[PDB]
């Protein structure tokens, strides 16, 4: 998309994902990620991460699905629907 | 100091001190973050999202002690010995 901009859909496997979506995202990339291979503790750890890799660059973090968040950039004007298509 | 910037120290009493930490850092600010009165799974919690908030803004997170951690800005040049008094 415009401005170097993309939705990165991706699954995780372990808390040293949050690389994954730590990379894509402070690069200014929306973030779809997959937990469904995540104990709930694994889980907790990613979106922990998340929100905070979130609140530092002003961005959004929502609820897909049980299973699926999303991080999205300040400036970014991405629909749950466009969020949802990419997952 | 220069550029907004200070050393933020912080007793921890739940993950609501997440945002607290974030808010501060974000704006350039060290934080200097006491983690005894929290349990462990909330010291985990405290702790991954402070890892996200690093990540995103290329921040050094340093153990000062077994219950004490920091968050460095990127561009700051902070000792331990400092992180340590204002702690
Ligand atoms: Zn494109
Ligand atoms: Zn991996
Ligand atoms: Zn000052
Ligand atoms: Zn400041
Ligand atoms: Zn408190
Ligand atoms: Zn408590």
């Known amino acids: ?37 995540l104990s709930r503790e694994e889980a907790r750890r990613i979106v922990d991460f998340a929100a905070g890799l979130c609140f530092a660059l002003r961005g959004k973090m929502q609820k897909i699905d049980s299973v699926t968040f999303a991080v999205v950039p300040e400036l970014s004007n991405i629909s749950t629907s466009e969020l949802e ?3």
């Open 1 to 37: 998309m415009s401005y170097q901009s993309t939705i990165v859909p991706v699954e995780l496997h372990s808390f040293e994902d949050a690389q994954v979506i730590g990379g894509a995202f402070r690069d200014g990339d929306a973030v779809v990620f997959d937990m469904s291979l």
């Open 85 to 87: 298509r990419a997952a």
